[PDB]
Amino acid sequence: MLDAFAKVVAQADARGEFLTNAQFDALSNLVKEGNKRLDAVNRITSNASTIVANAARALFAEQPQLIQPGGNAYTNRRMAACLRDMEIILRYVTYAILAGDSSVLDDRCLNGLRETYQALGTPGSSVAVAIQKMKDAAIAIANDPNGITPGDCSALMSEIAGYFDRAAAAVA
Amino acid sequence: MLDAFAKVVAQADARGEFLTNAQFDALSNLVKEGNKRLDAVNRITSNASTIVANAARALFAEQPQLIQPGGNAYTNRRMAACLRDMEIILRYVTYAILAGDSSVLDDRCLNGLRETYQALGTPGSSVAVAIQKMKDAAIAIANDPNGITPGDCSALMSEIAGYFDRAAAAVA
Amino acid sequence: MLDAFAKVVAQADARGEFLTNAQFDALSNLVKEGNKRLDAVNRITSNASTIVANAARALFAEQPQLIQPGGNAYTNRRMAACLRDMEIILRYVTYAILAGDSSVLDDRCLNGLRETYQALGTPGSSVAVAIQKMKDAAIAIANDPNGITPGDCSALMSEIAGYFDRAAAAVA
Amino acid sequence: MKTPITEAIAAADTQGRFLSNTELQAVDGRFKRAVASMEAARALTNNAQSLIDGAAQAVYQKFPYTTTMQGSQYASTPEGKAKCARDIGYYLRMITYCLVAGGTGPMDEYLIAGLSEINSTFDLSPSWYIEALKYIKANHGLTGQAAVEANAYIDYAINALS
Amino acid sequence: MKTPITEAIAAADTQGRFLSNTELQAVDGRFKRAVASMEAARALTNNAQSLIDGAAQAVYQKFPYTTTMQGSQYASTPEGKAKCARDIGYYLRMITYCLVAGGTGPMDEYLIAGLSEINSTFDLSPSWYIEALKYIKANHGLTGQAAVEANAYIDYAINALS
Amino acid sequence: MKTPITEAIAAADTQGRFLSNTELQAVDGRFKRAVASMEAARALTNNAQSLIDGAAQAVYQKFPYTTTMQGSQYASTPEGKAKCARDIGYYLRMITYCLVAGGTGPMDEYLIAGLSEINSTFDLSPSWYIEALKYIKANHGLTGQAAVEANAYIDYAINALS
Ligand SMILES: *[C@@H](C)[C@@H]1/C(=C/c2[nH]c(/C=C3N=C(/C=C4\NC(=O)C(CC)=C4C)C(C)=C\3CCC(=O)O)c(CCC(=O)O)c2C)NC(=O)[C@@H]1C
Ligand SMILES: *[C@@H](C)[C@@H]1/C(=C/c2[nH]c(/C=C3N=C(/C=C4\NC(=O)C(CC)=C4C)C(C)=C\3CCC(=O)O)c(CCC(=O)O)c2C)NC(=O)[C@@H]1C
Ligand SMILES: *[C@@H](C)[C@@H]1/C(=C/c2[nH]c(/C=C3N=C(/C=C4\NC(=O)C(CC)=C4C)C(C)=C\3CCC(=O)O)c(CCC(=O)O)c2C)NC(=O)[C@@H]1C
Ligand SMILES: *[C@H](C)[C@H]1/C(=C/c2[nH]c(/C=C3N=C(/C=C4\NC(=O)C(CC)=C4C)C(C)=C\3CCC(=O)O)c(CCC(=O)O)c2C)NC(=O)[C@@H]1C
Ligand SMILES: *[C@H](C)[C@H]1/C(=C/c2[nH]c(/C=C3N=C(/C=C4\NC(=O)C(CC)=C4C)C(C)=C\3CCC(=O)O)c(CCC(=O)O)c2C)NC(=O)[C@@H]1C
Ligand SMILES: *[C@H](C)[C@H]1/C(=C/c2[nH]c(/C=C3N=C(/C=C4\NC(=O)C(CC)=C4C)C(C)=C\3CCC(=O)O)c(CCC(=O)O)c2C)NC(=O)[C@@H]1C
Ligand SMILES: *[C@H](C)[C@H]1/C(=C/c2[nH]c(/C=C3N=C(/C=C4\NC(=O)C(CC)=C4C)C(C)=C\3CCC(=O)O)c(CCC(=O)O)c2C)NC(=O)[C@@H]1C
Ligand SMILES: *[C@H](C)[C@H]1/C(=C/c2[nH]c(/C=C3N=C(/C=C4\NC(=O)C(CC)=C4C)C(C)=C\3CCC(=O)O)c(CCC(=O)O)c2C)NC(=O)[C@@H]1C
Ligand SMILES: *[C@H](C)[C@H]1/C(=C/c2[nH]c(/C=C3N=C(/C=C4\NC(=O)C(CC)=C4C)C(C)=C\3CCC(=O)O)c(CCC(=O)O)c2C)NC(=O)[C@@H]1C
Incomplete structure (x- = not known):
């Protein structure tokens, strides 16, 4: 990568x-600007579970049709599966945050991702929604002023957002 | 399945x-209607060899071109191969007879079967003929009134035919 | 084969x-005409290294763009790779020389070779050039009158050329 | 999906052979067992509503905090309750499926697979369900085989929640 | 197809190396051996008809029941005989192929592979062919190497029918 | 491409886990080390021309035959020299890349991989380069870490030419 x-x-x-x-x-x-990058990863990484969790709730909240009988998230196997994808995506994003490059995200994560879902019937748009939501959630955490030495994180957050958006744009 | x-x-x-x-x-x-189903499988299964055998003879009988020099059944390797396919098909059909569903036949046997043969040059139509012939043969056996407690097998035979036809329609 | x-x-x-x-x-x-065939293989085979070597030099000589920064032969990994291909091709050709048939060359070497390069960005035309050059080089060696019992090698050389050309025509 | 019949096929298909007698004898056992089981399935389906609701309450008794504590994972509200009423329906609906299929397959595929992550993620508590379940076992008024079969799959749903 | 030349290539290609001397020496042996063999091939091909027919009869002598017993697998009829006349042709035609190729390859690929299932399925009997074959061996009027080579492949066709 | 950061990711990605602390601590070490290294990279790049040329000559001294002997692999001519001037540029350009990346990765991928076959094929001699290299090591006027790092990658280029 x-x-x-x-x-x-x-x-x-x-x-x-x-x-x-x-x-x-x-x-x-x-x-x-190194240290700042490290805090972002360490922070997003440390809250991965809650980051994913909340995004899911939000998602099914706006789109109840996915958890109807048969929607695609219906049944624990499928639901479990969706949760895994949100984490897979997230995990790759953090990898990108640390690299200062999206190659690893694009190559190991995003490519062919659109076809995969299509074949499966899984609605890309919705996945993109679940990504757009982890984004806000993750940026709230990374850029939280509490417990961290004051300073400008704008550049970085912008970049972090870039990655997430890049992903949602690769499956919608 | x-x-x-x-x-x-x-x-x-x-x-x-x-x-x-x-x-x-x-x-x-x-x-x-269980018992009746069991007799069908047990019967078709037990006569698999002769069922296949005769169908082959019939087939090459109506279509001598397949066993010319090069027709597709020419040479023991290819001929052997054809015999194997007739049995593979048959074997899956019996699986379907017992399941009360064709999923196992459709998924493990019939899908992509049409492309496979095409690539190889093997004439689907003919395979369908060899299937249509195992069908009559197998239904004569299953539904034979000798050695079995009298009763109506019509429903079942109809179903059994369904499966065979389903197969011939998936390669013709 | x-x-x-x-x-x-x-x-x-x-x-x-x-x-x-x-x-x-x-x-x-x-x-x-056996013996003559044997001398060709033994000869081409024995000079494989120099045959390849010189062709490469010739090639990059007429096409300096391939060894610019990024041309496709730029960098030792890629350059090494090109050298390997010239040898792979050559090696298969000799196999063909000995068989009196190109099946082995066509099947294990030339087929899909055009797509492969395309995907990679590698310019077929140029590969064809590198082949056309190994050809002249190899035919000079095989058909060299020194150190060999006098006799007509024309038929054979023509055939050997056939193979090489066949290859260049399968990637240009 | 795993059922006595499909396992039999799966076995035969693995070794590329036609079906044995042993296998055939197996399906027959399944057909024989299928009577009292279709009966359990029919019974429970006809009592669907009362078992759900009767189950709903029983879980608001053993675990009162769920009815008070605020937070989306709690029945403390309507939509909360709606969700739980839905889940016991799913649990009930699953047992009858296993009953109709002669195996835990239905339940395995549709509920069991992924159960942990999902309980762990949404902050759902097994207790709540083993509870609703324990009430179903003693409130289906089933007897003989119908109850034998029924109970078997219920306990399975419990161990799976352990 | 397996021939001395192709085996040599197959070996070299497996280890990704050019051809050795040992390999080259091998093809030369094949070319040297190719003379008396092309001769056997030419001879037999020119005697094609008499060997077939002479073979046909010889199998109606050692096994008379084939000429009487009714049933498609028997020469008891014309089309039956047609079939057998065809098969010895195939058998004969195969030996000369091996002769031209310097190996059993032709015979392996076109006849040997699948021989059992096919004899077993159509109720064909090996005896009939080992017979027709045994007649060919003592009726090709070949001598020296031409006969050596020829006979080698014939016996091979027999063991393959065992 | 292999860099301290990418190795860390590679490790985490292999076991399908998020990034550890140990890994994070690793990138920080790389950032800390990155200062004197970007400095070495900047220095050398600014002295690019003199080091190349000064290197060119030094290889025409230790190995005079290269300047006389005819043959395309020799600097005995202009285009010959052009080629060698180009190669030291490539060698120099590679060290700074490793410097910027915090590893031998750049050099590994762009030069090291395939080095042998290529030297062996074009009749290029390692000596010539270990020479040009040895001159660069004692002519970069670097001190402290900048020189430490720089030299490390240089020696690596030498062992790789052994
Ligand atoms: C965005 C994050 C905002 C912000 C940050 C800000 N952080 C720092 C400094 C540091 N962060 C760390 C943490 C780590 N360094 C590591 O190598 C690792 C991996 C093991 C971690 C977790 C460290 C060591 C520092 C420097 C020491 C310190 O605490 O100052 C600074 C400052 C400077 C700099 O960039 O170095 C700033 C300004 N503050 C916010 O409110 C932001 C949201
Ligand atoms: C169609 C097959 C027609 C027909 C059938 C007919 N068969 C039966 C009954 C039985 N068949 C079996 C055989 C098996 N049961 C098994 O579990 C297995 C696998 C190990 C086998 C091979 C059995 C046990 C019975 C029941 C006992 C009996 O002999 O009656 C019946 C009757 C009832 C029923 O369905 O159970 C009928 C009417 N008769 C024909 O002429 C048909 C062509
Ligand atoms: C083209 C090659 C031209 C030419 C050839 C020519 N060569 C020969 C004869 C022989 N070559 C060999 C070499 C081998 N035989 C082998 O089995 C092997 C593999 C181990 C090798 C390397 C041999 C043994 C002979 C025959 C003995 C001899 O030296 O005569 C002949 C002649 C006859 C024939 O074909 O056999 C000729 C005419 N001469 C040229 O100038 C060509 C360019
Ligand atoms: C009821 C016994 C108690 C209770 C339940 C409760 N459950 C949820 C949310 C979910 N439950 C599931 C479970 C399944 N979904 C399935 O498709 C299947 C298989 C058919 C099962 C078993 C899932 C996936 C969710 C979350 C997704 C969703 O909201 O639908 C909640 C809501 C949690 C939230 O944060 O919104 C609740 C409250 N709660 C109680 O207090 C009862 C004791
Ligand atoms: C969640 C936001 C939504 C959802 C997801 C869902 N995904 C799948 C199945 C697969 N997802 C992938 C994707 C990847 N695999 C990878 O290895 C990587 C890179 C590390 C990616 C991006 C794949 C390969 C599959 C299929 C393989 C498998 O099932 O494991 C499913 C399952 C579909 C099924 O029928 O089996 C689901 C449900 N579904 C939703 O409803 C959400 C909107
Ligand atoms: C002859 C020695 C005796 C004899 C022969 C007989 N053979 C068949 C039928 C078949 N024979 C073959 C064999 C081959 N087919 C091939 O392509 C090759 C390789 C070139 C071989 C060796 C096959 C495939 C068949 C069946 C298909 C077909 O009919 O062509 C029959 C007919 C059997 C039938 O039921 O119709 C007969 C009679 N019979 C004798 O009595 C002789 C002693
Ligand atoms: C017989 C009725 C006709 C005939 C058949 C024939 N088939 C093949 C080759 C293949 N058939 C399959 C099909 C399957 N493979 C499977 O695993 C399954 C599901 C269990 C199916 C349905 C495949 C994959 C092949 C190719 C692989 C192989 O060769 O084993 C051949 C051989 C073709 C060849 O050149 O090798 C033949 C001759 N041919 C006829 O003339 C009849 C009309
Ligand atoms: C210089 C120290 C001495 C010298 C060099 C010389 N080199 C070549 C030819 C080649 N050198 C390379 C090396 C590389 N190519 C790369 O892309 C990279 C990585 C960036 C490296 C290290 C290659 C591939 C060639 C051949 C292809 C080409 O011509 O470009 C020559 C020419 C040889 C010829 O026959 O034309 C020479 C002369 N020669 C000396 O005398 C110096 C002491
Ligand atoms: C040289 C004349 C030119 C050149 C070649 C070049 N080729 C590749 C990569 C590959 N070539 C093949 C071809 C084969 N592989 C085989 O196994 C066989 C049959 C035995 C053949 C014909 C393949 C599969 C590859 C890709 C796999 C690999 O890289 O090993 C490259 C590398 C491209 C890359 O980016 O990795 C190059 C450079 N390049 C030139 O500029 C010459 C004109």
Whole structure:
């Protein structure tokens, strides 16, 4: 896979050029902003269970049809399955948060994800909803001002949102 | 797979409803008519070899082109292969006879069967002929009045025919 | 796979006919011309390394774009890979030289080869160039008059060329 | 789905052989057993409503906090109760399915598989259900085989909640 | 198809290597052996008809019941005989194929593979063929290598019918 | 591509679990180490030309025959020299990549993988490069960690040429 740094090296090698000052400046602000990234992962990761849990409730709350007799989330096997997917997605997102790149999310998680669900009959749109909801939930946690040294997390949250959105856009 | 009973439960669960009196009546006539079903399987199963054998002869008899030099049944490897298919089909049919459902035949036997043969060059129509012939042969045996307690087998034979036909219609 | 002899038997069995005098005459000139075939394989095989090597140089010489930063042969992994393909192709060709048939080349080597490269982005045309070059190179060696009992190799070389061309035509 | 008949086929299909006698004898046992079982299934289905409701209450007695404590996982409200009334229906509906099929298959596939994660996630408590279940066992007025079969699958639903 | 040449390739291809000397020496042995064999093949093909017919009868002598007993698997009738005349043709045609290929490959692929099931299914009897075969071995007027090779493949057809 | 961060993910993804603390602590070590390394990377990139050229010559001194002997694999000509000037560029460019990534990954993927076959095929000699490399190590005017890191990857490029 690729991380923020390996990504830039990739782009340089492809032109057989050394990194430009602007590129060096980018990779050095990432490192500087390091600690903040670590808190995000550690935070999202630590609350994964509740993050998923609540999103599910929200989802079935707006879309009761999924938990009718036969909707796709009907029955514990299928319901269990949906819960697993929300976690699989989440887990990959955190991987992306730490890498500073979405390659790992795109490659191991999002690709062909749209076809898979289609074949199964599973409604992508809804999955996207469940993602859009974990997003708000996860960003509330990561960016919570309590218990953390004050500072600007905007850049990062924006990026974290990028990833989630990227995912919802890959299954809707 | 599904059996006559699991099939009805499937249809109910999908509406999250309990079985209707009419459904209970259906599953109870199946049980009552049980013994007859058992004789059919036991009978068809016990004569599998001769059932297949004769159908083959009949087939090559009406269609000598299949056993020319190169027709598809030419050569012992290919001929052997055809004989195996007639038995595979038959074997699945009996499975269906016992289940009171064709799920096992449709899923493990008939699906993609049409493509398979096409790729190979094997003429579906002919396979269907070989099936249509095992059908008459098998129904003569199952429904033979000798050596069995008198009673109405019509319903069942009709069903047994259903399965065979279902198969020939899945490869022609 | 098929060799020159098994090929003729194949064609006869398919008509359930015995070999015709003309067919027997063909298979007997092959045997007579045997030794020459053996020298070709032994020769091409023994010089495989230099055969491949030189073709590569020639190739990148006419097509410097492949060894730019990112061309497809850029980087030792990719370059190494190209070298391997030239050898894989060559190796199969020699197999064909010895069989008196291209079945082994067509089946284990050339089929789907065009798609494979396409998916990868690898330019078929160029691969064909690298093949066309190993051809001239290999035919110079096989048909070299030094160190070998004088005699007419034309027929054979023509055949050997056939194979190579067959390959370049299967990826261009 | 796992049923006596389908297991038999599954076995035969695994070794690529036609069906044995042993297998056939097995289906017959299932047909024989199917009488008192279809009876249990019919009974319970006809008493569906009273067993559900009678079950609903019994779980608001052994566990009063569920009726008071606020929080979506509690019957403390209407929609809460609606949910629980729905679940016992599902539990009841499942037993009769097993009854009709001659095995735990229905229950295994539709309820058992994934039960833990789902109870653990939505903060649902097994106690509540083993309770509603324990009430069903002593309130189905079944006797002879009909009750034997019925009870068997009920206990299964309990161990599965352990 | 299995031939001395193709086995050699098969070996080399398995280990992903070019062809060895040992392998090359092998093909040469096959070419050397190919002379008297193409000769046996040519001979037998030119005597095709008499060996078939002479073979046909010889099997109606050792096994008379085949000419009388009614039933499609018997030569008791024309179409019956037609079939048997066809089969010895197939058997004969197969030996020459092995001769041309320098191995039992042809015979293995086109006849041997599936031989049992097919004899067992159509109620065909090996005896009949080992018979027709035994007549071919002593009626091909072959000598030296031509006969050596020829006979080798014939016996192979027999053991395969055992 | 193998980097401290990606290895960490690779590990977590293999066992299907979220990221541990141990893993997180690992990335932090990488970020901490990333300072003096980005510095080494920046330095070397700014001295790119002189190190290349200074390296070019140093390999025409230890190995004079390369400047005289005819043959495309030799710098005996312009295009020959062009090629070698290009290769040290590639070698130099690779070290800084490893520096930016915090691992040998870049070098592994882009240069190391396939190095042998390629040196062996084009008749390229490791000596020439371990030489150009040995000159870079003592001509980057780096000190403290910047030099520590830099040198580490250089030696790696050498063992890989052994
Ligand atoms: C967003 C998160 C917002 C915010 C953050 C903010 N955090 C820090 C500093 C630190 N965070 C850590 C935590 C870790 N470092 C690690 O390597 C690991 C993995 C084992 C963890 C969990 C650390 C060590 C620091 C630095 C020491 C410190 O506490 O200062 C800072 C500051 C500086 C910086 O980036 O380093 C800030 C500004 N505060 C908010 O309200 C945000 C929502
Ligand atoms: C169709 C088959 C026609 C017909 C049948 C007919 N059969 C029976 C009864 C029985 N058949 C069996 C055989 C088995 N039972 C098994 O469990 C197994 C597997 C081990 C077998 C092979 C048995 C035990 C009976 C019942 C006892 C008896 O012989 O009566 C009946 C009758 C009743 C019923 O359905 O039970 C009938 C009417 N008769 C024909 O001519 C048909 C062609
Ligand atoms: C094309 C190759 C041209 C040419 C050839 C030519 N070669 C021969 C004869 C022989 N070659 C061999 C070599 C082998 N035989 C083997 O079985 C093996 C594998 C172990 C090898 C490597 C042999 C034994 C002979 C025969 C003995 C001899 O040297 O004469 C001949 C002649 C006859 C024939 O075909 O047998 C010719 C005419 N000469 C050229 O200039 C060609 C380019
Ligand atoms: C009743 C005994 C007690 C009670 C129940 C209660 N359950 C839920 C929510 C859910 N229950 C299930 C269970 C199933 N779904 C199935 O499809 C099947 C198989 C047919 C089973 C067994 C599920 C999936 C949910 C959540 C999804 C949903 O809301 O439908 C709740 C609600 C929890 C919430 O947060 O909204 C409640 C209250 N509660 C009690 O106090 C009773 C003692
Ligand atoms: C939840 C938000 C919704 C839902 C989900 C649901 N998903 C499946 C089944 C599968 N999901 C995947 C996806 C992945 N597998 C992977 O390994 C990865 C990367 C690590 C991904 C993204 C796959 C492969 C399956 C099928 C295999 C399997 O069943 O395990 C189901 C089950 C469908 C079924 O019939 O079996 C369900 C129900 N369903 C919903 O209703 C929600 C809206
Ligand atoms: C002859 C020695 C005796 C004899 C033969 C007889 N054979 C058959 C039928 C079949 N024989 C074969 C055999 C082959 N088919 C092949 O393609 C090959 C490889 C080239 C072989 C060896 C097959 C497949 C059949 C059945 C299909 C068909 O009819 O063609 C019969 C007819 C049996 C019937 O019931 O119709 C007979 C009579 N019978 C004798 O009495 C001779 C002693
Ligand atoms: C007989 C009625 C006709 C005939 C048949 C024939 N079939 C094949 C080859 C295959 N058949 C299948 C089918 C199945 N495989 C399965 O596992 C199942 C479910 C249990 C089915 C239905 C497959 C997969 C093959 C190919 C694999 C194989 O060869 O074993 C052949 C062989 C074709 C070949 O060239 O190899 C033949 C001849 N042929 C006829 O002429 C009859 C009309
Ligand atoms: C320089 C230290 C000495 C020298 C070098 C020389 N190299 C080549 C040819 C090649 N070098 C490579 C190496 C790489 N290609 C890559 O993409 C990478 C990773 C970025 C590496 C390390 C390759 C692939 C070639 C051949 C392909 C090509 O020509 O580009 C030559 C030319 C050989 C020829 O026959 O044309 C030379 C001369 N020669 C010296 O004398 C120096 C001491
Ligand atoms: C060289 C002339 C050109 C070139 C080649 C190149 N090829 C690949 C990758 C693959 N090639 C194959 C082909 C085969 N595999 C086989 O097993 C056989 C039969 C024995 C054949 C014909 C395959 C399967 C691959 C992909 C698998 C793999 O990478 O090993 C590459 C690599 C592409 C990549 O990104 O990984 C390259 C570079 N490239 C050129 O520029 C030349 C013009």
